[PDB]
Amino acid sequence: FVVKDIHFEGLQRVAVGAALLSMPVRTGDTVNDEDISNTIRALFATGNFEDVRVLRDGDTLLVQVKERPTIASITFSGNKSVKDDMLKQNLEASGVRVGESLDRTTIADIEKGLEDFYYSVGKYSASVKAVVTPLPRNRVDLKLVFQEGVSAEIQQINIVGNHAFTTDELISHFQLRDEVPWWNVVGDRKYQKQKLAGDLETLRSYYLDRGYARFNIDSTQVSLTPDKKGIYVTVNITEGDQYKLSGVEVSGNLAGHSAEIEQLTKIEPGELYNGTKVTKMEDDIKKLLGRYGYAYPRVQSMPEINDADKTVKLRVNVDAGNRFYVRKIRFEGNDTSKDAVLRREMRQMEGAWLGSDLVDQGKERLNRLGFFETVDTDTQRVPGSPDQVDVVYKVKERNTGSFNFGIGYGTESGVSFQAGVQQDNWLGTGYAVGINGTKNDYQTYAELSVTNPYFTVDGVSLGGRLFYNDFQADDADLSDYTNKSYGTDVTLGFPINEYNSLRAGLGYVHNSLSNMQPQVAMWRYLYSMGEHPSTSDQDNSFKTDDFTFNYGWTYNKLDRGYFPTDGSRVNLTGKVTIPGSDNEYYKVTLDTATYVPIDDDHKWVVLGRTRWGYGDGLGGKEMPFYENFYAGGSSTVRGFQSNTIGPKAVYFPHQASNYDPDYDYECATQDGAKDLCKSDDAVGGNAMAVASLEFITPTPFISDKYANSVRTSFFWDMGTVWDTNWDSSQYSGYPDYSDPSNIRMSAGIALQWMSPLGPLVFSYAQPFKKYDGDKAEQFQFNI
Amino acid sequence: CSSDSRYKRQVSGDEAYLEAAPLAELHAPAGMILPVTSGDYAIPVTNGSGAVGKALDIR
């Protein structure tokens, strides 16, 4: 009974030899009838075999195999609430998936773990079934149905043995409620045992600071009720007899810093015990020793809880490292960012004792960078030394680059368009790049602006502006207002502090205008400029080369640079003119932006976003018609269209406009359109008071892969722009302004979408209060 | 491909990665030999068979 040939069938992931070697009798090895059945089991033992049938031709063996392996599908059905991938994992927890060998032994272990998964959802009611369905040459489908019946739900927290407080008072610290009523908000509606696990520590920390050092939750028994819903937790506690943290006995290797350590561990002898501050008093020592370069201060309290007077004595056992810990540092996560620029945002310098806070302050500047997505580090000790740590600042940089656009000019009037591109510190080189401009029929516009914040390591923000607007208003050609405007503005942000920073610059405003409107706001301005622009024609010219002076200061208190959450920053910036300017004026503005989190989780932060300004002449003139302030849609009062808040673009009685076109671009023009006219486009005012009142809002159905950076934001937005200089006696046949009474309101929600092209905010907002005509756009896109 | 345009075998970023420009070794004078070969940057300099640059045969 020795085999001359075994017959090896049942293949396509198990070959002849993958059969034959997992046959314990090989071709040529002697056979027994037990070796035949040993060939039955050991061939099935590969986990590929629907069957093994070992026979022989006297001795010449014959092995009959049907094949389980690579699974070609797993179907998920009845899932719809839970997505199928969570069900794929417990299927894969059995080592079972598409393209791998079916083991029909673990069919229920797919399912039992899946219903135990369904048990650990917070349900228990599930019986699921993996269904083998064979497929070409060896393959199978393992269809899975998911009878996800009901979940388990908290109904009552039966804390038992509770005697320092009452049960619902302990429930008052917990959150296992249901049914936001028709008069209140209670929030949650579902059970998890991990919520209870957080609640049992909500219970203990509630007792631990009230003195109950020996508080103990004795046991807790979840009601595993029929209905599979009723969850009643038999929370046996022992209240633990509130004691008084009545002396700190801090000791150990204090590294010679025990005096300041004792100040960190200063308590009242006789105040009730607070284990939360007990651990805190160690961490007070820990950063303090870490500030001296003891990166590893082993600081260990011991609450000598003296029940005999209901007190606690706090032995603390300190053990610091040794001084010169920070040897070097590394920066990581800057493949699109030059390192030394972010190292200028690094305040822990190498070859030093560790400042544990020095590591954080550069990272705080890296958190206030905004060219990051996350900022962290790896404070790695170089071992073999109590003075060697290499701090690997792995920081996750920004999705740099950002695009800005209106809606179309391409293939409408030639090869002409609008543009705008941000780079978000191109290659992180200490040069934040944002460029705008447009080639239109109306205007040939180029405009250039870049900064060097690290021309100097102080933070001297070497930044300049340039533009050239060859703007002709191609309405007839130049019959409506021309403006060849160009010039420069270079302003250097000098830091007064790390919270205060100064700004100063000069403005060269070379505008070459000709054949302007018959309108109003420039006239009273150009009459203050000593010119008569044509009230009755459009042939008037006015050139201004304004040599101005710009100034600014900021306050810097806010969390992040790409998604801030708390703080308040104050920003003053205004302008004035110098001898050399064609118009003598000033134009001073200020805006307020505070972050007041009504939800301290920063899912709801008050976003008070207001806009102010006033500017007039400096020699008694007017602040320019190109400098009146504005608001409206796509602004802090968005939901209108833009330039709807303010005095309006109203026209004098008017005639031959150098031929404004025949019933086209009518501005009380000669072609149609007789005398004093107007428009609901705001011409804007020399005084502005508009505001946005926004709120952070969390997004649950949005997958939070970008909802950390995507913030939905409701608002109620109102305000006024007004020209105090405006003649409300000559333009009383027009919308005439001198006052913040045109307080137009539009209200709705904004949708800040942070794409890889930066935050692209979209907004729906309905105008409710409207003054002097607003072009309205209720849903507004702000690229 | 339908989206493969202006990117291939040529590297992203600074495109100097492929030309493989080698460098002259650090030399220290008499008595002042500080160690320079201690990194892996002292590489096995083995220009045995095949090509260099972008011209190395691929599969």
């Binding site: 493949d335 | 495109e15 493989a20 460098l23 650090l26 083995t46 599969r59």
Partner: protein, 218 residues
Amino acid sequence: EVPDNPPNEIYATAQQKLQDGNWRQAITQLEALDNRYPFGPYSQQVQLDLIYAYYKNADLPLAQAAIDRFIRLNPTHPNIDYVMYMRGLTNMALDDSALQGFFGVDRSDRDPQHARAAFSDFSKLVRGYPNSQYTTDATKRLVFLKDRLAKYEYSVAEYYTERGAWVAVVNRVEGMLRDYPDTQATRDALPLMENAYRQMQMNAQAEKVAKIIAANSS
């Protein structure tokens, strides 16, 4: 796609879709070979062809996966040398990504993260196969590639020289000086330490460094 064809029919469709330039269809075909028949006599070359598919398709880390799917699944057809070349070749492209290098603008000291990985795989070739039909480039690549690691490391030594952290200058410069035996940035790191030593009144160590510059002029 992912066809259940015969393994040559999954192969021959895959090889042409490489030569189509539509690598994602070669990827869909070459994987589908090694999905069903990775025991093919070309299934080794398939993984090599997958690296040849992925890395040109801007599917660069999947080339490194097919570099690993070659080394693990298909250790024969010994182009692990090519795979060590390719993982050095891919991770050079994987490190920096901004296309200003067409007209010659640097990105060479942002961070050489995968250029460190590209170093090691190029180092893996010149160690694991110092004789093979691919070690010519990687040897020439590595003596280059350290400089992109060095110019990054010099930009750290740039900052502490620019900040004034002369204790940290010696930390970065001798960091380069221990590291690189041929990068010129290390030779130009070298005087900053002397500048640090002169700033830290270690003028003896500064002139310990100064004759090294006289030999690292060479």
